[PDB]
């Protein structure tokens, strides 16, 4: 019963954390390669 709504709630909070990570990534230092930034950004989110 709880997980039913937890799905959407997790979606929203995940989007929010994504935006926070995007802000800090664009603030740290403007990396051409996609995986490098992307994989690193994902790693930062999981890690910090």
């Amino acid at each position: 019963r709880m997980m039913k709504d937890v799905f959407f709630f997790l979606f929203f909070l995940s989007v929010w954390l994504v935006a926070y990570g995007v802000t800090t990534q664009a603030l740290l230092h403007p990396d051409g390669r996609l995986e490098w930034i992307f994989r690193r950004v994902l790693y930062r989110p999981y890690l910090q």
Partner: peptide, 19 residues
């Protein structure tokens, strides 16, 4: 589980499972 995530050995879905 105790805050030790060695991305050097696991990274060359998962996030959803953790949460």
């Amino acid at each position: 589980i105790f805050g030790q995530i060695p991305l050097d050995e696991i990274d060359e879905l998962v996030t959803f499972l953790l949460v």
